[PDB]
Coordinates of C-alpha atoms in Angstrom, one line a residue:
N1 CA 5.1 -14.8 17.5
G2 CA 5.3 -12.6 14.4
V3 CA 6.0 -8.9 15.1
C4 CA 4.3 -6.3 13.0
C5 CA 5.3 -2.6 13.3
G6 CA 2.3 -0.3 13.0
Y7 CA 2.2 3.4 13.5
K8 CA 5.8 3.5 14.6
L9 CA 5.1 0.8 17.1
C10 CA 6.1 -2.9 16.8
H11 CA 3.9 -5.5 18.3
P12 CA 2.7 -9.1 17.6
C13 CA 0.6 -9.5 14.5

C-alpha cells in the first residue's frame, strides 16, 4: 500500500 521511491523509481515499500 505504501509507495517508496528508490533510485528515481517509486514502488511499494
